Amino acid sequence: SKNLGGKSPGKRFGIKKMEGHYVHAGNILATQRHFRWHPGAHVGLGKNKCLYALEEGVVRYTKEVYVPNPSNSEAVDLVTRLPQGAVLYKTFVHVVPAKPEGTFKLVAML
Amino acid sequence: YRSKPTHGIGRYKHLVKAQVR
Amino acid sequence: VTYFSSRKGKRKTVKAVIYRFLRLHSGLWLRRKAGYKKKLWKKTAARKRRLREFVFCNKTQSKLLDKMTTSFWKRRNWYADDPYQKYQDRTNLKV
Amino acid sequence: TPVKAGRLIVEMGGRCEFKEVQGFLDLVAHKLPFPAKAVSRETLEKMRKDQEERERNNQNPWTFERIATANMLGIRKVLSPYDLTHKGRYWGKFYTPERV
Amino acid sequence: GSKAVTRHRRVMHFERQKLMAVTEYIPPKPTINPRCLP
Amino acid sequence: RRAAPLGPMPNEDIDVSDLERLKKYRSFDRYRRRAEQEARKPHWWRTYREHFGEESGPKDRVDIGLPPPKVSRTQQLLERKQALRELRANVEEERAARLQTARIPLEAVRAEWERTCGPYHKQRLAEYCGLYRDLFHGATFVPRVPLHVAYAVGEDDLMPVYHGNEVTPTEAAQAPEVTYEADEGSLWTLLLTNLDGHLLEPDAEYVHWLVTNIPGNRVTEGQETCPYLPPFPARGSGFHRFAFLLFKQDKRIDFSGDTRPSPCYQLAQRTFHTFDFYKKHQDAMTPAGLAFFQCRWDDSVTRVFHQLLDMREPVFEFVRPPPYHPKQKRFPHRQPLRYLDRYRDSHEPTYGIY
Amino acid sequence: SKTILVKMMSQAGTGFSFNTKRSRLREKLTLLHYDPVVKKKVLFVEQKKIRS
Amino acid sequence: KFTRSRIPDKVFQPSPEDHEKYGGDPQYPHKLHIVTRIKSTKRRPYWEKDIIKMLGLEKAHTPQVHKNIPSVNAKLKVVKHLIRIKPLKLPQGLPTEEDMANTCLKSNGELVVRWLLN
RNA sequence: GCCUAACGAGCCUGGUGAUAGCUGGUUGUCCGAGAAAGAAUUUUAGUUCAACCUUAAAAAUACCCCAAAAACCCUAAAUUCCA
RNA sequence: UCGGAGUACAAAAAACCCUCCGAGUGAUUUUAAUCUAGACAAACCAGUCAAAAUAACCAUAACAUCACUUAUUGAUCCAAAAUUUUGAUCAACGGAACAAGUUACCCUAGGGAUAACAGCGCAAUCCUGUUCUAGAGUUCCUAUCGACAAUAGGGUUUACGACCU
Ligand SMILES: Nc1nc2c(ncn2[C@@H]2O[C@H](COP(=O)(O)O)[C@@H](O)[C@H]2O)c(=O)[nH]1
Ligand SMILES: [Mg+2]
Ligand SMILES: [Mg+2]
Ligand SMILES: [Mg+2]
Ligand SMILES: [Mg+2]
Ligand SMILES: [Mg+2]
Ligand SMILES: [Mg+2]
Ligand SMILES: [Mg+2]
Ligand SMILES: [Mg+2]
Ligand SMILES: [Mg+2]
Ligand SMILES: [Mg+2]
Ligand SMILES: [Mg+2]
Ligand SMILES: [Mg+2]
Ligand SMILES: [Mg+2]
Ligand SMILES: [Mg+2]
Ligand SMILES: [Mg+2]
Ligand SMILES: [Mg+2]
Ligand SMILES: [Mg+2]
Ligand SMILES: [Mg+2]
Ligand SMILES: [Mg+2]
Ligand SMILES: [Mg+2]
Ligand SMILES: [Mg+2]
Ligand SMILES: [Mg+2]
Ligand SMILES: [Mg+2]
Ligand SMILES: [Mg+2]
Ligand SMILES: [Mg+2]
Ligand SMILES: [Mg+2]
Ligand SMILES: [Mg+2]
Ligand SMILES: [Mg+2]
Secondary structure (H helix, E strand, C coil), X not given: CXXXXXXXXXXXXXXXXXXXXXXXXXXXXXXCCCCCCEEXXXXXXXCCCCEEECCCEEEEEXXXXXXXXXXXXXXXXXXXXXXXCCCCEEEEEEEEECCCCCEEEEEEEC | CCCXXXXXXXXXXXXXXXXXX | CCCCCCXXXXXXXXXXXXXXXXXXXXXXXXXXXXXXXXXXXXXXXXXXXXXXXXXXXXXXXXXXXXXXXXXXXHCCCCCCCCHHHCCCCCCCCCC | XXXXXXXXXXXXCCCXXXXXXXXXXXXXXXXXXXXXXCCCHHXXXXXXXXXXXXHHCCCCCCCHHHHHHHCXXXXXXXXXCCHHHHCCCEECCEECCCCC | CCCCCCCCCCCCCHHHHHHHXXXXXXXXXXXXXXXXXX | CCCCCCCCCCCCCCCCCCCCCCCECCCHHHHHHHHHHHHCCCCCCCCHHHHCCCCCCCCCCEECCCCCCCCCHXXXXXXXXXXXXXXXXXXXXXXXXXXXXXXXXHHXXXXXXXXXXXXXXXXXXXXXXXXXXXXXXXXXXXXXXXXXXXXXXXXXXXXXXCCCEECCCCCCCCCCEEECCCCCCCEEEEEEEECCCCCCCCCCEEEEEEEEEEECCCCCXXXXXXXXXXXXXXXXXXXXXXEEEEEEECCCCCCCCCCCCCCCCCCCCCCECHHHHHHHCCCCCEEEEEEEEEECCCCXXXXXXXXXXXXXXXXXXXECCCCCCCCCCCCCCCCCHHHHHHXXXXXXXXXXXX | CCEEEEEEEECCCCCCEEEEEEXXXXXXXXXXXXXXXXXXXXXXXXXXXXXX | CCCCCCCCHHHHCCCXXXXXXXXXXXXXXXXXXXXXXXXXXXXXXXXXXXXXXXXXXXXXXXXXXXXXXXXXXXXXXXXXXXXXXXXXXXXXCCCCCCCCCCCEECCCCEEXXXXXXX
């Protein structure tokens, strides 16, 4: 007819790990098409806007302030156009590390 | 989320409006 | 697959599986990624690495290949300077 | 133009009484597809207070709102999610003002 | 299978009919008729 | 479904209507300042600090120290304004400022800083390094009096010990000189404590040099309870903290339980708890000076371990946790050939019966 | 505007080729690529045309 | 779509008259629930079937004793349209180890410890 | 059209137990558990996987799941994750 | 065949010969490597990310960038390459290496899983009555009609469905 190509499978864009989930390094916390959840502490950002934990720990979700990069012209312009009392807020995903860095073990008593 | 009390904390499009007689 | 041959009455094997597959003595099967030699200029470096990397087969394909291959290919093999001799066996399988 | 129940269609004013406007508006209300009446501010207020009084002095302890909100008898299996807001007064496009 | 909104009054499921009959309005009836009560 | 916010929303104060009459900030720096100002407030929602350890938020710190110097604020402000006006009246200083050729007497700046606001900076850095977290566990003090500690490397080489400095055991082998201003009517106690280096007890610390009943500034004439011991950190676990604590006392304190022998080479006797020490001497002693420094392992530690302490040198190493691996599957799907190498016991071919 | 597929080899003497999409109306292709055989920043020049 | 039903907390806010209507103590709540299954789980959702299964109410018209804790009260609220719930009454106290074989549960909701004395 | 009562290409024998995703049938008793469809396919009259399910064997967590948490102009019934 | 929006309102998935946008590529230089934890997605094949470590440039980044950036693409085998690559509107796009019409001269195995006739469901269409009065009727809505509209009934025509054969 006139409407063609409307069939396309879903890309499973969603949130994988919720708050309190114990994850390891490299686990993909969430995937998205547009910036819905921003990475925070110990969460990387893949080139397809996916979020993966960098350290092993507990996943948390926090509402925080948004201070954009000065090089991002669109965000900078939005910031300057914001009124005097307005502060941008976003939802960030964090990983609280549970495993210590290491332990000082005795090797040899020389 | 919508059912959470913190819904609409990121609402910013109402703070900037950028789309005589 | 010929379950009963005409000359000897034995069970034959398909040559495609032995040509494009490798069976380890642990029961696993080895195979290459599909499309690792087609249009390398159009693909990303990570995608090319994934194509070049070897992969395994799951239970269903392993059982299919075992059915389609005779027990001669399931024997223990001691080749000289065999790269896969270290992978022939399985260790620390808590099942 | 979609019209719901309880929405005004034509609103009139002036220095006239209610009898004549009701008299020549009842024909329009009847010829309208949905049931309609020629009401005024006083008539609308009177009906709303009458409905409030009826639903407040209802004698039987069992009401559609109570049962639907409490999931008595597992009735939400038969009911619709919009019945929690309709409170049994609206069924499809039909509205019965006598059903509390 | 009919739509949610129809013109034929959408004859209702029996348990909903019973629910409506149970929840029908009951007006308050006084003990003595006040017309020619004192 | 909608829920009511548990408190005031962030941007609910400003009016949405008539935005053109509301002033804006056009500076990314202004927005950054506002954002960092707001980020420090105790919001009712789950913030970053709560999950990443703001250290129990507010803490009512017990103050154990001397009262602050009572200074006449009005006269101090008048003198400061007069000094500023006299400095402003000069024309040569203005010329230097315009021509961008101006210098500052850093020695006088440091002296004035120590005199007026050095104690607060020292206290906050000692917070940051966790001195009070391990010495009193609940109490912070203001180092009101200065404390200049200096080690002598030779005839003309002097290494200062500032708050957080790094001094090697080669420099710290000999007893240091301590200077502080005090009249000839008070008594002081100096205590050098090693916070890290106790092999057995984690909740205990070492003593290196404890001298008590110091008349005024003269530290040598005061009786030394514990003789000086050069620092001995472990080779692996480095950067231990050594703190000189100076206490002012009123009465002539004598103690027979904390007395240490002249050799004092027994680590069993060289085990200390500043909490219990201040509990014992809480009536008279009050901490007024503090100077802590970092110390790592060098070649001189072996001599201390062998000749003095009569022990073998312990060697440590920062070992890392083993990498995490999932449960090995019977039939891994689409996994690389190296999947079997992640669970290999050793890189040695094992022939079972052959 | 049709593109061209060109196979370019290393100028470091070692045999190392890679394919690149180019515009037909451009000059001969010459770039600075990375050679893993010599592990160096190597000038690569056009020699062959594979696909249109 | 037909899904599970959220019951607002206003339903479980007892009125002052409810106590003397249902014979309950307004100030001490009771301790144990006697729960009986009246209706069938047929023509009922699978989650309700699972709740009935985990409450130990497979056989209808057979009472089961449960605690009065919110953990089980949640499931009781979920399947409250299929069960009759009474407070366990102990006119003669808890049965000791010597009265375990001589106990009975009268249909009025009480547990008698001395039943059929000789 | 006709070629021995059926000719858009005779009849017999052999290949031949032709081949049929198509139709029909499939023979004693009792007991246990027990399934209505996601993806490909000259494929939707069928096959091959996945999800279910059956007979055995290893283990340990499995359903219900309070908080807390899951987006930005408005958005209901309610969903996911866990004590 | 592939992607975006609603249907599919809030984790994921979700169809129609459902309503709309597109894609089968262009431009530029920063020409964008090797190896390997751990994960997303998925029947399978495929697609996706990616911590640490190594080679070359600041001795501080390298995910090539932009066009709604999401789609801009194709599996074996085989041919040409010569050390390392490429080759298909295989567009019926999980692709047979290459095969058109007509049969009312037709045949066979099946299907009421699927049409033409009948039956049946609905009443778009058709036919009836009543409600509403502006208007025609020389004045006058209803002697005879009655536009724009309302309610209800019948199952005669065609259409729709594909439930019995
Ligand atoms: N062009 C091309 N032909 C192929 C391929 N694979 C098989 N073929 C077959 O190889 C033959 C090539 O003959 P051509 O069409 O060049 O005269 C055709 O039968 C074609 O179908 C392929 O990958 N590319
Ligand atoms: Mg879609
Ligand atoms: Mg689809
Ligand atoms: Mg009407
Ligand atoms: Mg329906
Ligand atoms: Mg002042
Ligand atoms: Mg014949
Ligand atoms: Mg046959
Ligand atoms: Mg078929
Ligand atoms: Mg059975
Ligand atoms: Mg059945
Ligand atoms: Mg919850
Ligand atoms: Mg759980
Ligand atoms: Mg998965
Ligand atoms: Mg790296
Ligand atoms: Mg096809
Ligand atoms: Mg196909
Ligand atoms: Mg596909
Ligand atoms: Mg003819
Ligand atoms: Mg036939
Ligand atoms: Mg049919
Ligand atoms: Mg069918
Ligand atoms: Mg027809
Ligand atoms: Mg018909
Ligand atoms: Mg019939
Ligand atoms: Mg019809
Ligand atoms: Mg009809
Ligand atoms: Mg007229
Ligand atoms: Mg059908």
